[PDB]
Design a protein around this ligand. Sequence first.
Ligand SMILES: NC(=O)c1ccc[n+]([C@@H]2O[C@H](COP(=O)([O-])OP(=O)(O)OC[C@H]3O[C@@H](n4cnc5c(N)ncnc54)[C@H](OP(=O)(O)O)[C@@H]3O)[C@@H](O)[C@H]2O)c1
Ligand SMILES: NC(=O)c1ccc[n+]([C@@H]2O[C@H](COP(=O)([O-])OP(=O)(O)OC[C@H]3O[C@@H](n4cnc5c(N)ncnc54)[C@H](OP(=O)(O)O)[C@@H]3O)[C@@H](O)[C@H]2O)c1
Ligand SMILES: C[C@H](Nc1ccc(C#N)n(C)c1=O)c1cc2cc(Cl)ccc2[nH]c1=O
Ligand SMILES: C[C@H](Nc1ccc(C#N)n(C)c1=O)c1cc2cc(Cl)ccc2[nH]c1=O
Ligand SMILES: [Cl-]
Ligand SMILES: [Cl-]
Lengths: 412, 415
Amino acid sequence: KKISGGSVVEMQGDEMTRIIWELIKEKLIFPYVELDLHSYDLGIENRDATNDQVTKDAAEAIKKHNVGVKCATITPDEKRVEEFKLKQMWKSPNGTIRNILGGTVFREAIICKNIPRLVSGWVKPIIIGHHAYGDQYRATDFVVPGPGKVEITYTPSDGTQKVTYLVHNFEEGGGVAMGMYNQDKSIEDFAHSSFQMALSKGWPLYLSTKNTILKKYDGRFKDIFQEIYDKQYKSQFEAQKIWYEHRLIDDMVAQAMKSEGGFIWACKNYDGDVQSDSVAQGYGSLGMMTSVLVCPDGKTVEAEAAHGTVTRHYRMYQKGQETSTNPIASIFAWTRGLAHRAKLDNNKELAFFANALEEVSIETIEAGFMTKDLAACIKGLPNVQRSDYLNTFEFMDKLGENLKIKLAQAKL
Amino acid sequence: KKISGGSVVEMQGDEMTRIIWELIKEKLIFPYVELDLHSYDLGIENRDATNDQVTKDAAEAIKKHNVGVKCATITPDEKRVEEFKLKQMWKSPNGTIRNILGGTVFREAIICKNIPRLVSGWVKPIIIGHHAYGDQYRATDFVVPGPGKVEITYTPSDGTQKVTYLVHNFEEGGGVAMGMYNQDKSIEDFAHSSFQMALSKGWPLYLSTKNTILKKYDGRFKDIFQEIYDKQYKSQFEAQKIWYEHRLIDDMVAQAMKSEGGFIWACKNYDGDVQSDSVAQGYGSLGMMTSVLVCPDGKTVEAEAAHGTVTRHYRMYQKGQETSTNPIASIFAWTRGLAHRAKLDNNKELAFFANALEEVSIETIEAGFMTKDLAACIKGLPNVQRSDYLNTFEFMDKLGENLKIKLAQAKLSLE
Ligand SMILES: NC(=O)c1ccc[n+]([C@@H]2O[C@H](COP(=O)([O-])OP(=O)(O)OC[C@H]3O[C@@H](n4cnc5c(N)ncnc54)[C@H](OP(=O)(O)O)[C@@H]3O)[C@@H](O)[C@H]2O)c1
Ligand SMILES: NC(=O)c1ccc[n+]([C@@H]2O[C@H](COP(=O)([O-])OP(=O)(O)OC[C@H]3O[C@@H](n4cnc5c(N)ncnc54)[C@H](OP(=O)(O)O)[C@@H]3O)[C@@H](O)[C@H]2O)c1
Ligand SMILES: C[C@H](Nc1ccc(C#N)n(C)c1=O)c1cc2cc(Cl)ccc2[nH]c1=O
Ligand SMILES: C[C@H](Nc1ccc(C#N)n(C)c1=O)c1cc2cc(Cl)ccc2[nH]c1=O
Ligand SMILES: [Cl-]
Ligand SMILES: [Cl-]
């Protein structure tokens, strides 16, 4: 009787999201879908036990099966080394996985009619993608201890004359200096992933840069996107009545603020971390922010929540205290992964199910059943009372009962 | 009869803001205050006629008199060179003035109870400052045409060991590469200006950086701020029950979103342009965003609106079409400049007037009289009808009429 789901790579994670992840599987997925799960435990102590090889193996399995669904993981810092007695500060699994796959991470906010938006006008979500988590990760920085010239040079491999550019002549005192870069192939992958994302959604695409200032650096992004668009995607976009345009970031922000949402935005910038995005943080609930890593081909995806492991809630849970952890972004990591699996395999039953679970999630909240973070979006955190929300387990139970009702009603 | 205002440097500007600037002077300032105005025409044609010397002269007058009030100016690009047949693409006057004063531009949103808030919890405004408009302006960028090494080198003037750092080895294909820098003195000015701004407001200060990634580059900002704080400001902050703390930008954004506002934020970042700040663009109109250039000594200020010259409205004005240009940020450039003048001179009458004009501006909007941009904030742009707003001239007349009423009532409340 269960839906034949097919091959899905699953990456288990840490702390509160690891608890919610199991509730999702037990209550929302496994009662209705049978899957050929290729499970990789990306929990912090199994990552330490395999010297982070499990992360690389999981990344390779996604490349092989084209569908990944990942739970939030701990990115180690020095406290985590003291906490778990780690071998070394293992790098972010999110960073390791998208490096190995060569994809673009697109973020999307899950919208509910009763949850106020930062901008009232935004009727459809805005999907934003960044170039390999931002240029901040491709920087080489140092202290200039005193006077002297800082220069950036390019020495051709073919033996042609080197080109030197003056960064700054420090005439008196010191300062700081740094070098950043991008490879053409990485920009091309970013363009292809962005065009594929726009065609799969049936929404227009904008690329934003600061090409008025970084005329050469940002100009290259504008040129590569336009070249790829004209040659390969223009007719396909026209057929769906969508378009692609470059925008100076100044105009893009003003435009996005006056729009109704419903577009893809390839944002060329320095910091692609969701944590430092004031609009992502201003929505009031990181629990509603999902992410999808899309590839140039448009055939491989890895879906995960944009939020972290929710350590503060995990500490309450460890003491037997009630929590109200929002599972929506984690649920949409499963629905987005399953929707892609269903598309690749022409599995109408799995496609129907994946959409129904997203609908049930939104309808539950729209009917006034929600976690504390969402009740705080409506009333303001100081005005929230216990009767305004459901705890983590009550909310999962409500979704499970509404999903059973949705699928029972559908049989007719 | 009129208030003796004292010495104020005035910089006239361009397009729609120049029109509003004159309406402010005629209707809101000159009927009540007498000023020793040191006027500099920073209009695009006069800047071109003096080869941008007027900009430098204005900056020097600000240093002497300590109070500047500036109108929005055109920053020339290739289209403007063609438009006005300019001799060269003159640099941003805002950038030139900031560079001469060694100041930091702090932005503040003007709040009206009836204009919806972006974050409900923000009961007090957040004042944000950037480092010399962001590092994007201190970049040297180029195309890497093909395979090869990109390296960044430092060659000491004293002849000691040259240090080379690999930016990237381009093995297959090309790409792009760039170098950015900051001078210590510029970071020190930024720290001093930020500490002075926090002390003058009586609000705590946060510096944000990405020092987890740019450990050397951003670490230098954290170190310079802490050094200066401990050496010249800790006791003064402690006396006012305020504090200074560095924050990783990730934590600062989460903290700011859960706060009540009421703090100064020195934001170390790449792009300090207001027009690419989603929060500045997300709340109200840029007509409600004012700015103040503050200097390391905490004595000199230059106030101006954070928005531009509003060229789209100027084109409507040039063709006799009605406009609805918000003058609030420009008015607050005058009130903030005059409030500083009053503080420096202990001029209670000018301090009282500057505050009364800010109150009249906010009260007018709160009583339902506003420009189209503000009516669209409340109703949503599609639902705005002509009867929901006042045109540029009607709004200035209403403010003028309400200012006359405010000052008449103040006199009648005496005895
Ligand atoms: N922050 C990120 O986006 C992120 C991404 C990947 C990995 N990580 C890892 O996650 C771990 C914890 O990071 P963190 O605590 O800084 O960030 P976090 O897990 O995203 O939690 C920060 C706070 O946001 C709220 N929150 C986040 N997700 C929520 C949800 N599903 N439902 C309800 N509230 C939610 C909670 O606020 P209240 O405390 O007000 O309830 C929570 O304490 C770290 O080890 C980090 O390496 C973080
Ligand atoms: N000195 C400065 O403070 C400064 C700052 C920024 C730019 N600039 C210069 O100003 C010129 C115009 O640049 P820009 O168009 O990007 O900037 P802008 O003048 O800020 O105008 C952009 C748009 O923002 C809205 N807007 C801004 N201020 C407004 C106000 N007072 N009332 C109502 N709406 C307002 C309008 O939107 P709608 O079109 O939807 O009505 C306007 O078209 C350029 O020459 C630029 O260099 C100078
Ligand atoms: C992916 C995310 N999407 C949304 C965030 C918040 C809200 C609200 N309210 N909505 C509707 C989004 O779609 C997003 C949007 C965004 C928009 C602008 Cl103008 C600037 C930065 C943004 N960053 C985001 O992460
Ligand atoms: C100077 C400006 N201040 C305000 C903008 C918008 C609103 C609203 N609503 N308020 C209250 C401000 O104080 C500002 C704040 C800001 C805050 C965050 Cl979290 C991020 C970026 C910001 N940029 C701004 O320009
Ligand atoms: Cl950025
Ligand atoms: Cl930035």
